[PDB]
């Protein structure tokens, strides 16, 4: 009973039910211009191209 | 006449009509793990947090 009521109805968003979506940790990306060039990394022919 | 026919109908995708969308230069992003940490960059309080 306790767990049914705890995990049914209106409740805190569970990241396990939405592919790890944590509203507290809403993930985004910011555009930054590299000021100092980065060290090389290795990837395949198509990726480098 | 020539410009109407050139820029009407089925034609090469014009990036100016689709917010700079160039099919020849389809932009994507790849996840990379930093192997050597980058040099500092400056941003605001909320951005750093």
Swiss-Prot record, chains A, B:
Top-level division of the source organism's lineage: Eukaryota
Family as reported in the entry's similarity comment: Belongs to the thiolase-like superfamily. Fungal fatty acid synthetase subunit alpha family.
Role, per record: Fatty acid synthetase catalyzes the formation of long-chain fatty acids from acetyl-CoA, malonyl-CoA and NADPH. The alpha subunit contains domains for: acyl carrier protein, 3-oxoacyl-[acyl-carrier-protein] reductase, and 3-oxoacyl-[acyl-carrier-protein] synthase.
Quaternary data: [Alpha(6)beta(6)] hexamers of two multifunctional subunits (alpha and beta).
Name under which the protein is recorded: Fatty acid synthase subunit alpha
